[PDB]
Short mmCIF file of N, CA and C in Angstrom, two decimals:
data_model
loop_
_atom_site.label_atom_id
_atom_site.label_comp_id
_atom_site.label_asym_id
_atom_site.label_seq_id
_atom_site.Cartn_x
_atom_site.Cartn_y
_atom_site.Cartn_z
N UNK S 1 8.42 -8.82 55.81
CA UNK S 1 8.40 -8.50 57.22
C UNK S 1 7.73 -7.22 57.63
N UNK S 2 8.00 -6.07 56.84
CA UNK S 2 7.49 -4.80 57.16
C UNK S 2 6.04 -4.79 56.95
N UNK S 3 5.54 -5.38 55.79
CA UNK S 3 4.14 -5.45 55.40
C UNK S 3 3.23 -6.17 56.31
N UNK S 4 3.66 -7.37 56.82
CA UNK S 4 2.99 -8.15 57.81
C UNK S 4 2.80 -7.50 59.13
N UNK S 5 3.80 -6.74 59.61
CA UNK S 5 3.62 -5.98 60.83
C UNK S 5 2.54 -4.86 60.73
N UNK S 6 2.45 -4.13 59.57
CA UNK S 6 1.54 -3.00 59.28
C UNK S 6 0.16 -3.47 59.41
N UNK S 7 -0.11 -4.74 58.91
CA UNK S 7 -1.37 -5.46 58.94
C UNK S 7 -1.83 -5.71 60.38
N UNK S 8 -0.91 -6.09 61.29
CA UNK S 8 -1.14 -6.27 62.67
C UNK S 8 -1.50 -5.03 63.35
N UNK S 9 -0.82 -3.92 62.93
CA UNK S 9 -1.09 -2.60 63.41
C UNK S 9 -2.53 -2.18 62.98
N UNK S 10 -2.95 -2.43 61.67
CA UNK S 10 -4.25 -2.08 61.13
C UNK S 10 -5.34 -2.71 61.99
N UNK S 11 -5.13 -3.95 62.27
CA UNK S 11 -6.09 -4.70 63.08
C UNK S 11 -6.34 -4.05 64.46
N UNK S 12 -5.31 -3.57 65.20
CA UNK S 12 -5.42 -2.87 66.42
C UNK S 12 -6.14 -1.62 66.43
N UNK S 13 -5.93 -0.74 65.35
CA UNK S 13 -6.73 0.48 65.04
C UNK S 13 -8.13 0.16 64.70
N UNK S 14 -8.41 -0.85 63.89
CA UNK S 14 -9.74 -1.24 63.47
C UNK S 14 -10.54 -1.73 64.65
N UNK S 15 -9.98 -2.44 65.63
CA UNK S 15 -10.63 -2.91 66.86
C UNK S 15 -11.06 -1.71 67.65
N UNK S 16 -10.20 -0.67 67.77
CA UNK S 16 -10.54 0.56 68.35
C UNK S 16 -11.59 1.39 67.75
N UNK S 17 -11.65 1.27 66.41
CA UNK S 17 -12.58 2.04 65.58
C UNK S 17 -13.99 1.39 65.53
N UNK S 18 -14.19 0.28 66.32
CA UNK S 18 -15.32 -0.62 66.42
C UNK S 18 -15.80 -1.21 65.08
N UNK S 19 -14.80 -1.50 64.14
CA UNK S 19 -15.12 -2.15 62.88
C UNK S 19 -14.61 -3.51 63.03
N UNK S 20 -15.47 -4.36 63.58
CA UNK S 20 -15.27 -5.75 64.05
C UNK S 20 -14.92 -6.66 62.85
N UNK S 21 -15.53 -6.46 61.66
CA UNK S 21 -15.35 -7.26 60.44
C UNK S 21 -13.98 -7.11 59.93
N UNK S 22 -13.53 -5.80 59.92
CA UNK S 22 -12.29 -5.33 59.33
C UNK S 22 -11.10 -5.76 60.15
N UNK S 23 -11.19 -5.80 61.50
CA UNK S 23 -10.05 -6.28 62.30
C UNK S 23 -9.62 -7.73 61.99
N UNK S 24 -10.57 -8.67 61.87
CA UNK S 24 -10.28 -10.07 61.52
C UNK S 24 -9.67 -10.25 60.17
N UNK S 25 -10.19 -9.49 59.21
CA UNK S 25 -9.64 -9.45 57.87
C UNK S 25 -8.16 -9.06 57.77
N UNK S 26 -7.81 -8.04 58.57
CA UNK S 26 -6.44 -7.62 58.76
C UNK S 26 -5.57 -8.61 59.39
N UNK S 27 -5.99 -9.39 60.38
CA UNK S 27 -5.20 -10.47 60.98
C UNK S 27 -4.93 -11.64 60.08
N UNK S 28 -5.90 -11.83 59.14
CA UNK S 28 -5.75 -12.89 58.15
C UNK S 28 -4.57 -12.69 57.28
N UNK S 29 -4.53 -11.38 56.95
CA UNK S 29 -3.45 -10.80 56.17
C UNK S 29 -2.08 -10.85 56.84
N UNK S 30 -2.11 -10.67 58.16
CA UNK S 30 -0.86 -10.70 58.93
C UNK S 30 -0.12 -12.06 58.82
N UNK S 31 -0.67 -13.15 58.28
CA UNK S 31 -0.04 -14.40 58.25
C UNK S 31 -0.17 -15.28 59.43
N UNK S 32 -1.11 -14.97 60.32
CA UNK S 32 -1.28 -15.62 61.59
C UNK S 32 -2.65 -16.28 61.52
N UNK S 33 -2.73 -17.36 60.81
CA UNK S 33 -4.00 -18.17 60.72
C UNK S 33 -4.40 -18.72 62.07
N UNK S 34 -3.44 -19.04 62.97
CA UNK S 34 -3.75 -19.58 64.26
C UNK S 34 -4.52 -18.65 65.07
N UNK S 35 -4.20 -17.28 64.96
CA UNK S 35 -4.87 -16.22 65.66
C UNK S 35 -6.25 -16.00 65.14
N UNK S 36 -6.40 -16.11 63.81
CA UNK S 36 -7.68 -16.10 63.15
C UNK S 36 -8.62 -17.11 63.72
N UNK S 37 -8.14 -18.41 63.94
CA UNK S 37 -8.92 -19.49 64.55
C UNK S 37 -9.36 -19.14 65.93
N UNK S 38 -8.42 -18.57 66.76
CA UNK S 38 -8.71 -18.19 68.14
C UNK S 38 -9.80 -17.12 68.30
N UNK S 39 -9.92 -16.15 67.34
CA UNK S 39 -10.96 -15.15 67.40
C UNK S 39 -12.29 -15.79 66.89
N UNK S 40 -12.20 -16.87 66.09
CA UNK S 40 -13.38 -17.62 65.71
C UNK S 40 -14.15 -18.32 66.75
N UNK S 41 -13.45 -18.93 67.70
CA UNK S 41 -13.92 -19.59 68.87
C UNK S 41 -14.56 -18.61 69.87
N UNK S 42 -13.91 -17.43 69.97
CA UNK S 42 -14.29 -16.27 70.79
C UNK S 42 -15.61 -15.63 70.25
N UNK S 43 -15.71 -15.50 68.90
CA UNK S 43 -16.91 -15.00 68.14
C UNK S 43 -18.13 -15.94 68.27
N UNK S 44 -17.82 -17.22 68.36
CA UNK S 44 -18.82 -18.24 68.62
C UNK S 44 -19.46 -18.03 70.03
N UNK S 45 -18.52 -17.78 70.97
CA UNK S 45 -18.81 -17.41 72.34
C UNK S 45 -19.64 -16.14 72.50
N UNK S 46 -19.30 -15.06 71.77
CA UNK S 46 -20.00 -13.88 71.66
C UNK S 46 -21.38 -14.02 71.12
N UNK S 47 -21.58 -14.83 70.00
CA UNK S 47 -22.79 -15.13 69.29
C UNK S 47 -23.72 -15.93 70.22
N UNK S 48 -23.17 -16.82 71.05
CA UNK S 48 -23.93 -17.53 72.16
C UNK S 48 -24.54 -16.65 73.24
N UNK S 49 -23.79 -15.61 73.64
CA UNK S 49 -24.21 -14.68 74.61
C UNK S 49 -25.29 -13.76 74.15
N UNK S 50 -25.20 -13.40 72.84
CA UNK S 50 -26.26 -12.66 72.14
C UNK S 50 -27.51 -13.50 71.79
N UNK S 51 -27.35 -14.82 71.51
CA UNK S 51 -28.32 -15.79 71.19
C UNK S 51 -28.47 -15.84 69.70
N UNK S 52 -27.61 -15.11 68.93
CA UNK S 52 -27.81 -14.94 67.56
C UNK S 52 -26.72 -14.03 67.06
N UNK S 53 -26.38 -14.17 65.79
CA UNK S 53 -25.41 -13.37 65.16
C UNK S 53 -25.80 -11.86 65.08
N UNK S 54 -24.72 -11.04 65.15
CA UNK S 54 -24.67 -9.62 65.09
C UNK S 54 -25.11 -9.11 63.74
N UNK S 55 -25.72 -7.98 63.70
CA UNK S 55 -26.17 -7.28 62.48
C UNK S 55 -25.70 -5.87 62.56
N UNK S 56 -24.91 -5.48 61.59
CA UNK S 56 -24.36 -4.17 61.36
C UNK S 56 -24.80 -3.91 59.91
N UNK S 57 -24.95 -2.76 59.37
CA UNK S 57 -25.34 -2.51 57.99
C UNK S 57 -24.38 -3.03 56.91
N UNK S 58 -23.02 -2.94 57.23
CA UNK S 58 -21.93 -3.48 56.36
C UNK S 58 -22.08 -5.02 56.36
N UNK S 59 -22.22 -5.71 57.50
CA UNK S 59 -22.40 -7.06 57.72
C UNK S 59 -23.63 -7.56 57.03
N UNK S 60 -24.67 -6.73 57.02
CA UNK S 60 -25.88 -7.10 56.31
C UNK S 60 -25.65 -7.31 54.83
N UNK S 61 -24.91 -6.39 54.12
CA UNK S 61 -24.60 -6.48 52.70
C UNK S 61 -23.76 -7.79 52.31
N UNK S 62 -22.66 -8.14 53.02
CA UNK S 62 -21.87 -9.25 52.71
C UNK S 62 -22.54 -10.60 52.87
N UNK S 63 -23.39 -10.68 53.97
CA UNK S 63 -23.92 -11.93 54.39
C UNK S 63 -25.14 -12.22 53.51
N UNK S 64 -25.92 -11.18 53.13
CA UNK S 64 -27.13 -11.30 52.33
C UNK S 64 -26.82 -11.91 50.94
N UNK S 65 -27.13 -13.17 50.72
CA UNK S 65 -26.94 -13.98 49.62
C UNK S 65 -26.99 -15.40 50.18
N UNK S 66 -27.48 -15.57 51.40
CA UNK S 66 -27.53 -16.81 52.13
C UNK S 66 -28.32 -16.56 53.33
N UNK S 67 -28.95 -15.37 53.40
CA UNK S 67 -29.77 -14.87 54.47
C UNK S 67 -30.85 -14.13 53.85
N UNK S 68 -32.15 -14.30 54.04
CA UNK S 68 -33.19 -13.38 53.75
C UNK S 68 -32.99 -11.98 54.15
N UNK S 69 -33.80 -11.03 53.52
CA UNK S 69 -33.71 -9.55 53.69
C UNK S 69 -32.30 -9.11 53.35
N UNK S 70 -31.99 -7.92 53.84
CA UNK S 70 -30.67 -7.66 54.49
C UNK S 70 -29.73 -7.11 53.43
N UNK S 71 -30.25 -6.79 52.24
CA UNK S 71 -29.47 -6.34 51.14
C UNK S 71 -29.69 -4.84 51.24
N UNK S 72 -28.63 -4.04 51.45
CA UNK S 72 -28.73 -2.70 51.87
C UNK S 72 -27.76 -2.16 50.89
N UNK S 73 -28.32 -1.41 49.88
CA UNK S 73 -27.62 -0.77 48.80
C UNK S 73 -26.85 0.35 49.36
N UNK S 74 -25.69 0.69 48.68
CA UNK S 74 -24.91 1.92 48.92
C UNK S 74 -24.03 1.66 50.14
N UNK S 75 -23.09 0.69 49.97
CA UNK S 75 -22.07 0.39 50.92
C UNK S 75 -20.92 0.53 49.99
N UNK S 76 -19.65 0.95 50.34
CA UNK S 76 -18.47 1.16 49.42
C UNK S 76 -18.35 0.15 48.34
N UNK S 77 -17.89 0.58 47.16
CA UNK S 77 -17.75 -0.20 45.95
C UNK S 77 -16.74 -1.27 46.05
N UNK S 78 -15.73 -1.13 46.95
CA UNK S 78 -14.81 -2.17 47.28
C UNK S 78 -15.54 -3.35 47.90
N UNK S 79 -16.52 -3.14 48.79
CA UNK S 79 -17.25 -4.26 49.48
C UNK S 79 -18.12 -5.04 48.46
N UNK S 80 -18.63 -4.29 47.46
CA UNK S 80 -19.58 -4.95 46.53
C UNK S 80 -19.02 -5.78 45.47
N UNK S 81 -17.78 -5.63 45.03
CA UNK S 81 -17.25 -6.22 43.89
C UNK S 81 -16.43 -7.35 44.30
N UNK S 82 -15.83 -7.24 45.53
CA UNK S 82 -15.08 -8.27 46.18
C UNK S 82 -15.79 -9.55 46.46
N UNK S 83 -17.05 -9.46 46.99
CA UNK S 83 -17.89 -10.49 47.43
C UNK S 83 -18.47 -11.27 46.26
N UNK S 84 -18.62 -10.67 45.10
CA UNK S 84 -19.03 -11.27 43.82
C UNK S 84 -17.90 -12.18 43.29
N UNK S 85 -18.09 -13.50 43.65
CA UNK S 85 -17.32 -14.63 43.37
C UNK S 85 -17.84 -15.80 44.27
N UNK S 86 -18.75 -15.38 45.15
CA UNK S 86 -19.34 -16.13 46.28
C UNK S 86 -18.39 -16.83 47.35
N UNK S 87 -17.12 -16.36 47.53
CA UNK S 87 -16.12 -16.76 48.54
C UNK S 87 -16.55 -16.64 49.99
N UNK S 88 -17.59 -15.85 50.21
CA UNK S 88 -18.11 -15.53 51.47
C UNK S 88 -19.02 -16.60 52.07
N UNK S 89 -19.83 -17.27 51.19
CA UNK S 89 -20.66 -18.44 51.51
C UNK S 89 -19.81 -19.58 52.05
N UNK S 90 -18.64 -19.89 51.44
CA UNK S 90 -17.80 -20.84 51.97
C UNK S 90 -17.11 -20.51 53.34
N UNK S 91 -16.67 -19.26 53.40
CA UNK S 91 -15.87 -18.83 54.61
C UNK S 91 -16.70 -18.66 55.85
N UNK S 92 -18.00 -18.34 55.53
CA UNK S 92 -19.03 -18.06 56.57
C UNK S 92 -19.76 -19.32 56.99
N UNK S 93 -19.52 -20.50 56.34
CA UNK S 93 -20.23 -21.69 56.57
C UNK S 93 -20.16 -22.23 57.98
N UNK S 94 -19.04 -22.24 58.75
CA UNK S 94 -19.06 -22.67 60.20
C UNK S 94 -19.89 -21.72 61.10
N UNK S 95 -19.86 -20.36 60.99
CA UNK S 95 -20.68 -19.33 61.77
C UNK S 95 -22.07 -19.61 61.38
N UNK S 96 -22.34 -19.91 60.12
CA UNK S 96 -23.70 -20.07 59.62
C UNK S 96 -24.44 -21.18 60.22
N UNK S 97 -23.64 -22.25 60.46
CA UNK S 97 -24.16 -23.44 61.18
C UNK S 97 -24.57 -23.16 62.59
N UNK S 98 -23.79 -22.22 63.30
CA UNK S 98 -24.09 -21.90 64.63
C UNK S 98 -25.39 -21.17 64.77
N UNK S 99 -25.56 -20.17 63.88
CA UNK S 99 -26.66 -19.25 63.75
C UNK S 99 -27.94 -20.03 63.45
N UNK S 100 -27.83 -21.03 62.56
CA UNK S 100 -28.85 -21.99 62.11
C UNK S 100 -29.26 -22.92 63.21
N UNK S 101 -28.38 -23.30 64.14
CA UNK S 101 -28.53 -24.06 65.37
C UNK S 101 -29.48 -23.46 66.36
N UNK S 102 -29.40 -22.15 66.68
CA UNK S 102 -30.40 -21.46 67.47
C UNK S 102 -31.80 -21.47 66.85
N UNK S 103 -31.82 -21.25 65.52
CA UNK S 103 -33.02 -21.19 64.67
C UNK S 103 -33.84 -22.42 64.75
N UNK S 104 -33.13 -23.61 64.71
CA UNK S 104 -33.70 -24.91 64.81
C UNK S 104 -34.22 -25.31 66.16
N UNK S 105 -33.60 -24.87 67.22
CA UNK S 105 -34.12 -24.94 68.54
C UNK S 105 -35.36 -24.24 68.75
N UNK S 106 -35.48 -22.99 68.22
CA UNK S 106 -36.66 -22.15 68.40
C UNK S 106 -37.88 -22.62 67.57
N UNK S 107 -37.53 -23.36 66.46
CA UNK S 107 -38.47 -23.85 65.48
C UNK S 107 -39.00 -25.18 65.87
N UNK S 108 -38.51 -25.65 67.04
CA UNK S 108 -38.94 -26.86 67.69
C UNK S 108 -38.57 -28.00 66.70
N UNK S 109 -37.33 -27.88 66.20
CA UNK S 109 -36.72 -28.86 65.36
C UNK S 109 -35.48 -29.27 66.07
N UNK S 110 -35.78 -29.87 67.26
CA UNK S 110 -34.93 -30.28 68.36
C UNK S 110 -34.10 -31.46 67.93
N UNK S 111 -34.60 -32.25 66.98
CA UNK S 111 -33.84 -33.36 66.45
C UNK S 111 -32.64 -32.88 65.72
N UNK S 112 -32.81 -31.92 64.75
CA UNK S 112 -31.79 -31.36 63.91
C UNK S 112 -30.87 -30.36 64.57
N UNK S 113 -31.35 -29.65 65.58
CA UNK S 113 -30.69 -28.75 66.41
C UNK S 113 -29.51 -29.45 67.06
N UNK S 114 -29.67 -30.68 67.60
CA UNK S 114 -28.72 -31.57 68.18
C UNK S 114 -27.63 -31.97 67.14
N UNK S 115 -28.08 -32.31 65.93
CA UNK S 115 -27.17 -32.63 64.82
C UNK S 115 -26.14 -31.59 64.41
N UNK S 116 -26.55 -30.36 64.38
CA UNK S 116 -25.59 -29.34 64.06
C UNK S 116 -24.57 -29.05 65.08
N UNK S 117 -25.03 -29.13 66.37
CA UNK S 117 -24.16 -28.92 67.53
C UNK S 117 -23.09 -30.03 67.62
N UNK S 118 -23.46 -31.29 67.39
CA UNK S 118 -22.54 -32.40 67.39
C UNK S 118 -21.42 -32.27 66.36
N UNK S 119 -21.78 -31.76 65.10
CA UNK S 119 -20.88 -31.64 63.94
C UNK S 119 -19.71 -30.71 64.22
N UNK S 120 -20.13 -29.54 64.82
CA UNK S 120 -19.24 -28.44 65.33
C UNK S 120 -18.33 -28.89 66.39
N UNK S 121 -18.77 -29.65 67.43
CA UNK S 121 -17.97 -30.19 68.50
C UNK S 121 -16.94 -31.19 67.92
N UNK S 122 -17.24 -32.14 67.04
CA UNK S 122 -16.30 -33.10 66.45
C UNK S 122 -15.03 -32.50 65.80
N UNK S 123 -14.91 -31.16 65.64
CA UNK S 123 -13.80 -30.69 65.01
C UNK S 123 -12.76 -30.48 66.12
N UNK S 124 -11.50 -31.04 65.99
CA UNK S 124 -10.60 -31.23 67.17
C UNK S 124 -9.87 -30.00 67.58
N UNK S 125 -10.42 -28.78 67.22
CA UNK S 125 -9.76 -27.57 67.43
C UNK S 125 -10.16 -26.86 68.72
N UNK S 126 -11.00 -27.62 69.43
CA UNK S 126 -11.52 -27.22 70.67
C UNK S 126 -10.72 -27.89 71.73
N UNK S 127 -10.28 -27.26 72.79
CA UNK S 127 -9.38 -27.92 73.60
C UNK S 127 -10.02 -28.33 74.93
N UNK S 128 -10.74 -27.49 75.71
CA UNK S 128 -11.29 -27.94 76.97
C UNK S 128 -12.08 -26.86 77.56
N UNK S 129 -12.12 -25.63 76.93
CA UNK S 129 -12.84 -24.49 77.53
C UNK S 129 -13.79 -23.90 76.55
N UNK S 130 -13.77 -24.42 75.32
CA UNK S 130 -14.74 -24.06 74.27
C UNK S 130 -15.49 -25.28 74.02
N UNK S 131 -15.60 -26.05 75.11
CA UNK S 131 -16.31 -27.30 75.41
C UNK S 131 -17.10 -27.10 76.72
N UNK S 132 -16.41 -26.55 77.83
CA UNK S 132 -17.04 -26.24 79.14
C UNK S 132 -18.23 -25.30 78.91
N UNK S 133 -18.04 -24.33 78.06
CA UNK S 133 -19.09 -23.36 77.73
C UNK S 133 -20.32 -24.03 77.10
N UNK S 134 -20.15 -24.90 76.00
CA UNK S 134 -21.26 -25.50 75.27
C UNK S 134 -22.21 -26.46 76.03
N UNK S 135 -21.60 -27.29 76.95
CA UNK S 135 -22.39 -28.31 77.61
C UNK S 135 -23.41 -27.77 78.63
N UNK S 136 -22.95 -26.69 79.39
CA UNK S 136 -23.82 -25.98 80.30
C UNK S 136 -24.78 -25.01 79.62
N UNK S 137 -24.43 -24.51 78.42
CA UNK S 137 -25.44 -23.72 77.76
C UNK S 137 -26.49 -24.45 77.00
N UNK S 138 -26.09 -25.55 76.34
CA UNK S 138 -26.99 -26.23 75.45
C UNK S 138 -27.08 -27.74 75.75
N UNK S 139 -26.02 -28.51 75.64
CA UNK S 139 -26.24 -29.95 75.45
C UNK S 139 -26.97 -30.59 76.67
N UNK S 140 -26.46 -30.39 77.92
CA UNK S 140 -26.94 -31.01 79.08
C UNK S 140 -28.35 -30.51 79.48
N UNK S 141 -28.66 -29.18 79.58
CA UNK S 141 -29.98 -28.76 80.10
C UNK S 141 -31.16 -28.97 79.23
N UNK S 142 -30.94 -28.79 77.88
CA UNK S 142 -32.00 -28.86 76.89
C UNK S 142 -32.23 -30.26 76.36
N UNK S 143 -31.19 -31.01 76.11
CA UNK S 143 -31.22 -32.25 75.34
C UNK S 143 -30.99 -33.47 76.18
N UNK S 144 -30.27 -33.42 77.34
CA UNK S 144 -30.10 -34.67 78.00
C UNK S 144 -30.87 -34.69 79.31
N UNK S 145 -31.40 -33.57 79.76
CA UNK S 145 -32.22 -33.60 80.94
C UNK S 145 -33.65 -34.15 80.52
N UNK S 146 -34.07 -33.86 79.24
CA UNK S 146 -35.30 -34.30 78.65
C UNK S 146 -35.02 -35.64 77.98
N UNK S 147 -35.92 -36.60 78.15
CA UNK S 147 -35.81 -37.89 77.54
C UNK S 147 -36.89 -37.89 76.44
N UNK S 148 -36.40 -38.33 75.30
CA UNK S 148 -37.21 -38.28 74.11
C UNK S 148 -36.49 -38.97 73.02
N UNK S 149 -35.26 -39.52 73.47
CA UNK S 149 -34.35 -40.22 72.56
C UNK S 149 -34.06 -41.55 73.09
N UNK S 150 -34.16 -42.52 72.19
CA UNK S 150 -33.86 -43.89 72.35
C UNK S 150 -32.41 -44.14 72.06
N UNK S 151 -31.60 -44.55 73.10
CA UNK S 151 -30.22 -44.92 72.80
C UNK S 151 -29.99 -46.42 72.94
N UNK S 152 -28.74 -46.94 72.73
CA UNK S 152 -28.44 -48.37 72.86
C UNK S 152 -27.00 -48.40 73.38
N UNK S 153 -26.37 -49.58 73.49
CA UNK S 153 -25.17 -49.76 74.24
C UNK S 153 -24.04 -49.00 73.54
N UNK S 154 -23.85 -49.13 72.23
CA UNK S 154 -22.97 -48.47 71.42
C UNK S 154 -23.06 -46.99 71.28
N UNK S 155 -24.35 -46.46 71.18
CA UNK S 155 -24.61 -45.07 71.14
C UNK S 155 -24.20 -44.39 72.40
N UNK S 156 -24.38 -45.01 73.62
CA UNK S 156 -23.96 -44.59 74.88
C UNK S 156 -22.49 -44.61 74.97
N UNK S 157 -21.79 -45.65 74.37
CA UNK S 157 -20.35 -45.85 74.46
C UNK S 157 -19.61 -44.75 73.85
N UNK S 158 -20.09 -44.35 72.69
CA UNK S 158 -19.50 -43.31 71.88
C UNK S 158 -19.50 -41.95 72.57
N UNK S 159 -20.59 -41.63 73.29
CA UNK S 159 -20.71 -40.57 74.19
C UNK S 159 -19.70 -40.57 75.32
N UNK T 1 -18.21 -25.84 55.11
CA UNK T 1 -17.68 -26.77 56.10
C UNK T 1 -16.35 -27.36 55.64
N UNK T 2 -16.29 -27.75 54.37
CA UNK T 2 -15.07 -28.33 53.81
C UNK T 2 -13.88 -27.41 54.01
N UNK T 3 -14.05 -26.14 53.63
CA UNK T 3 -12.99 -25.16 53.77
C UNK T 3 -12.50 -25.06 55.21
N UNK T 4 -13.45 -24.96 56.14
CA UNK T 4 -13.12 -24.87 57.56
C UNK T 4 -12.30 -26.07 58.00
N UNK T 5 -12.75 -27.26 57.62
CA UNK T 5 -12.06 -28.49 57.98
C UNK T 5 -10.63 -28.47 57.45
N UNK T 6 -10.48 -28.07 56.19
CA UNK T 6 -9.17 -28.00 55.57
C UNK T 6 -8.26 -27.06 56.35
N UNK T 7 -8.78 -25.89 56.70
CA UNK T 7 -8.02 -24.90 57.46
C UNK T 7 -7.57 -25.49 58.79
N UNK T 8 -8.48 -26.17 59.47
CA UNK T 8 -8.17 -26.79 60.75
C UNK T 8 -7.04 -27.80 60.59
N UNK T 9 -7.14 -28.62 59.55
CA UNK T 9 -6.12 -29.63 59.28
C UNK T 9 -4.77 -28.97 59.06
N UNK T 10 -4.76 -27.89 58.28
CA UNK T 10 -3.54 -27.16 58.00
C UNK T 10 -2.92 -26.64 59.29
N UNK T 11 -3.77 -26.07 60.15
CA UNK T 11 -3.31 -25.55 61.44
C UNK T 11 -2.68 -26.66 62.26
N UNK T 12 -3.34 -27.81 62.29
CA UNK T 12 -2.84 -28.96 63.04
C UNK T 12 -1.48 -29.40 62.52
N UNK T 13 -1.33 -29.41 61.20
CA UNK T 13 -0.07 -29.80 60.57
C UNK T 13 1.03 -28.81 60.95
N UNK T 14 0.70 -27.52 60.94
CA UNK T 14 1.62 -26.49 61.40
C UNK T 14 2.07 -26.76 62.83
N UNK T 15 1.12 -27.08 63.69
CA UNK T 15 1.42 -27.38 65.09
C UNK T 15 2.38 -28.57 65.18
N UNK T 16 2.10 -29.61 64.40
CA UNK T 16 2.94 -30.80 64.38
C UNK T 16 4.36 -30.43 63.98
N UNK T 17 4.48 -29.62 62.93
CA UNK T 17 5.78 -29.17 62.45
C UNK T 17 6.54 -28.43 63.55
N UNK T 18 5.84 -27.53 64.23
CA UNK T 18 6.46 -26.77 65.32
C UNK T 18 6.96 -27.70 66.41
N UNK T 19 6.13 -28.68 66.76
CA UNK T 19 6.49 -29.65 67.79
C UNK T 19 7.74 -30.41 67.38
N UNK T 20 7.80 -30.83 66.12
CA UNK T 20 8.94 -31.56 65.60
C UNK T 20 10.21 -30.71 65.65
N UNK T 21 10.06 -29.43 65.34
CA UNK T 21 11.18 -28.50 65.37
C UNK T 21 11.70 -28.39 66.80
N UNK T 22 10.78 -28.30 67.75
CA UNK T 22 11.14 -28.21 69.16
C UNK T 22 11.67 -29.54 69.68
N UNK T 23 11.15 -30.63 69.12
CA UNK T 23 11.54 -31.95 69.49
C UNK T 23 13.00 -32.15 69.21
N UNK T 24 13.53 -31.52 68.14
CA UNK T 24 14.84 -31.66 67.77
C UNK T 24 15.72 -30.72 68.50
N UNK T 25 15.16 -29.84 69.36
CA UNK T 25 15.86 -28.80 70.11
C UNK T 25 16.01 -29.29 71.54
#
């Protein structure tokens, strides 16, 4: 009980200290996976507003092993030894898809861009407002206002 | 993706459990 509360407290200080990576890590620890999910949806929202994922020098070191460039030597020894097991590639895989989604749009790989967005939406953890945001930003203006796709009765039904 | 899906499923199961607990209340 005492330990879990301290973790919650750490997260509040870390948010203040503008160490965005470290606050989520602390909430994970607090035993509140549900809250972890809620900041994930919010981070997706943030990443949409930026048009692309955030880059901090600490963030550059962890993520680099699935991202070109970005390997920046001389970040604390705790950060470097922890990540060696490749646990980060798995945990980062849903954010990575989002980030890759913008990339594919810009690369005029509009077919595949649609595919990644659909995969993310199918996960039932979205309730009705992390849906309102996506359709007006991406699905309706870019992909359904333009005709370039052949549908049929069933494909329409599923929609 | 697999990990994320698993986590989501776990969360959903937790929610179900909570609902059942309240259902009995």
